[PDB]
Symmetry: C2
């Protein structure tokens, strides 16, 4: 009985720019493993990475998958792994891009795609290393209700900082207050972004974890404390020019970073911290689940437009 | 026999709207009162015009004297701390003469070497030279071997940056505003230099000057140029934001900003700084280093001297255009 792998290829975002292809996978050769997707991730970074993706190719992505059949002793049948296999239901691998797992049974495996995964790590190094928080600071976080934002705010809180979050809906604002943000506002409905930031924090901000860029970032600059630090993580919002006056006179430090910069022991340690914090209830998690591999492009679309509260996860 | 002194001062007649013009200034002449005990009468010898004045002027009240530092001689004194004849650096603004009770008088230039023009105290061995020293050595944080790019390379700051970089064993590329400036930069030691105002492609000029890209960008210009430089930075590259001359005349209508994608993927570090950050012994050490370097010939200098106090506004306008080669200095 042969297995049929369904994959989402980039046709030309909108549904029409995605095309599902089906292929019968060949038998396993020695050293290979047959994997079945359990939970697939859709992330903001994909919209950009789609660039060098020649049409017809399977979309890039990470997923949590189970080993169904195996001829690889490192990955026995029944094993659960993290793979960079892209948007596909089944795939064959010689073990190249796979990471081990089964991890407390009480934690859903899909957390390895979010809070105890890439987004969680982005939040961790972004806040603890780029911003360099040590406690007592006032931290601003944009797209605060997203996968990265939600973690940044909760880590800031456990480190004893005052935390302000900017999100895209009133539903999200209630959520942020629920996970511990000291202040939270809908940046889309502000009368004055400048005054909202002032209201949120009269004395300004020590660190700004940026996921939006553009106008938001520019306005934030004027409210940074001297020697303030801005960690450029993403830019969901051509952006208007920043004021040189603020950067120079307040002597601000702006640094862009990619989570992949940190590897080895430091990365392993950060994942243990993230898992520990989740087990201690210090970092609550929420996954916006879309059921059905057939609904992945839609899930991807829904996420990009901000209809997602927390980590976007698609179940096979 | 008391003869009165008349002080001439350049006042900001109207706040700058876009590029400053002669009509924005108004010369005033005033009869100075006699000195009271504890006061001193100073006569400007050399006056400075600097990029920061374009922005600092926004805080002035119309009719006020333009701000600025100058080297002045104490003509008469009733203040024991400033004897008649002494030379001082003072923040008295654009004025030929002024009375001070000690306020504004930053320091005596008593130990100054005669072979060095006093105006170097306003440039290479002054604020611009300090800005370059700390911007390069502390912000860019060079250790040697890096490839440094500096905009407005032939200006007061840029000229010093490139020279200190060279003594530190760095490769230096200068983006200057004229062909004469290119020749000058090469003569003082820059490894490469191009005219960013005439080169067909800024991208190709940067690539040609350094195929492997840049470790630090000492930014004096900002704007479109800065945005273009980001694509040429090496991963983890550092950009020291010193000034933004290309946008000082359009702070209310700024051009598009830098690519978030370049900053993120190249993982760049941008830091603004002002020379005020370094005070005390650290600043004194820098000044001593700057003077030693100038006396030894390791740091060459050129002053862009405009003769006559009545030409100060034009000197300021020219410098703002980035057209001065070396420190813009006005002789009274
Ligand atoms: Cl199985
Ligand atoms: Cl959000
Ligand atoms: Cl997400
Ligand atoms: Cl003005
Ligand atoms: Cl006014
Ligand atoms: Cl120049
Ligand atoms: Cl100058």
């Amino acid at each position: 009985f042969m297995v049929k792998a369904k994959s989402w290829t980039l046709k030309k975002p909108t549904q029409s720019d995605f095309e599902l292809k089906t292929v019968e996978l060949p038998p396993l050769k020695n050293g290979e493993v047959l994997l079945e997707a359990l939970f697939l991730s859709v992330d903001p970074y994909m919209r950009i990475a789609s660039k060098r993706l020649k049409e017809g190719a399977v979309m890039m992505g990470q997923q949590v998958a189970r080993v169904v059949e195996s001829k690889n002793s490192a990955f026995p049948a029944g094993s659960i792994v993290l793979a960079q296999s892209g948007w596909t239901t089944h795939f064959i691998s010689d073990g190249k891009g796979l990471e081990k797992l089964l991890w407390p049974d009480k934690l859903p495996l899909s957390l390895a795609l979010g809070t105890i995964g890439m987004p969680g790590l982005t939040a961790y190094f972004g806040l603890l290393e780029v911003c360099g928080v040590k406690g007592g600071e006032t931290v601003l976080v944009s797209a605060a209700a997203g996968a990265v934002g939600s973690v940044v705010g909760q880590i800031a809180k456990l480190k004893g900082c005052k935390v302000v979050g900017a999100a895209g809906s009133d539903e999200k604002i209630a959520y942020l207050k629920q996970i511990g943000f000291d202040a939270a506002f809908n940046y889309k409905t502000v009368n004055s972004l400048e005054e909202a930031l002032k209201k949120a924090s009269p004395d300004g901000y020590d660190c700004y974890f940026d996921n939006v860029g553009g106008e938001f970032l520019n306005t934030v600059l004027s409210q940074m404390k001297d020697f303030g630090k801005i960690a450029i993580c993403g830019a969901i919002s051509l952006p208007p020019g920043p004021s040189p006056e603020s950067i120079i006179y307040k002597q601000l430090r702006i640094e862009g970073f990619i989570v992949y910069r940190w590897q080895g022991d430091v990365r392993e340690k950060a994942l243990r911290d993230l898992m520990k914090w989740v087990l201690e209830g210090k970092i609550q998690y929420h996954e916006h689940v879309t059921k059905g591999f057939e609904n992945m492009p839609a899930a991807f679309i829904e996420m990009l437009n901000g209809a997602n509260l927390g980590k976007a996860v698609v179940t096979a």
